[model samples]
Target: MPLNQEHPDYTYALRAADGRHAKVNEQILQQSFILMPDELVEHWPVPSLGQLQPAHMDAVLALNPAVILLGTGERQQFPSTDVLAACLTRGIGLEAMTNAAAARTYNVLASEGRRVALAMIVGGLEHHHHHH
Candidate 1:
């Protein structure tokens, strides 16, 4: 079932993200991190691509989401096999894209009421809302 009914008032959207900055709710960020509709992981252990480790997935899995969007800081990239294996074990779907693309996807998924989480790089929380 699709969620055209709109999100709850407490929803937070990833408004934007370039290479060094992002907007979410009410903050600024410059470190690699993750951004969920309701939670954020700052200073992610993998400051950049090629450094993503299996250990990092530990935190990602903790969110207990059915799907995850991984926003590589500057562009789309893939993690190591070990890291992906961790996600496989938990039956969580993972998508990789640039931080900017991930931000856009997050907005769409949230609007459709999917349980999606975004693991992104350094980005802040500048609130943006679309009310009907």
Candidate 2:
């Protein structure tokens, strides 16, 4: 088990995350969600990558993040062109990968106080570890 502590605010970290679930500050969120350095949205309304829409990306943009970490469920899946375009419209970088990798990246940047947003598509897929 892992835990995190620091800063009065802006100190959100992911203790652990797989395809099935993501652990953040002792809260196990089983559904797809969005996470920022200081905020966590319990439900992202995105069940999977296939169901992604440009509006989905818009929601994260509303949070005003510099970059976004897209966790595409159990595998490293890419979103459609329109979805990618949404990020470029705001001149923000969107990094796509498996949930585990996204979680790890989120933790690192968040701890460093980066204005990063992490969106995890947890569609109840099989557990996978792609840490290479």
Candidate 3:
């Protein structure tokens, strides 16, 4: 679905790869989303959150998703407050989480009819290859 600046944060029901739904950050607000290959992430460039430029904005806008999830490696901090606000101002939903959590979140939101975008920081550019 198309994401607009006024869209409110929706509750994300978490699920495992095996298709079991579970409880997770029920009150968390997201600003970005990412899709990645099948590998556990360990480290993410946390500082880049503040360096979001036009290119990053363009990448996000191109996705035209309801939520943009950022996979911050194995930790859950990145895309500083400024970046989040910038995205919100541009009419893009955003969220940041560990790589694995992001994957699950993307699936859950998508299944619920929300168009999602993902920014993963693991492996390499090859991992971003997709048919869709």
Q: Indicate which candidate wins on lDDT.
A: 2
Summarize candidate 1's per-residue lDDT along 71-119 as a digit string, tens digits: 7667556877877788788887888888877777777888887788777
Tell me which of candidates 1 and 3 scores higher on lDDT. Answer: 1
Worst 10 residues of 2 by lDDT: 1-10
How far off is model 1, as Cα RMSD? 8.7
Q: In model 2, where do residues sit more than 4 Å from their true spots?
A: 1-12, 125-132
Q: Report the poorest 10 consecutive residues by lDDT, candidate 3.
A: 15-24
Q: For residues 1-132, what per-residue lDDT tens digits would candidate 3 score against the true structure? A: 666435445534433221121123342212223342222122233234556554555655664666777666554555656666667787777776766777677777766766666565432223236776
The deviation in Å at residue 62 for candidate 3 is 2.8
Please identify which of the two predictions, 1 or 3, would achieve the higher TM-score against the true structure.
Answer: 1
What global local distance difference test value does model 1 have?
0.70
Q: Quick one: ranking by lDDT, best first? A: 2, 1, 3
Off by over 4 Å in 1: 1-11, 122-132
Per-model TM-score, in order, reads 0.72, 0.78, 0.50
Question: What are the Cα lDDT values of the candidates?
Answer: 0.70, 0.76, 0.51
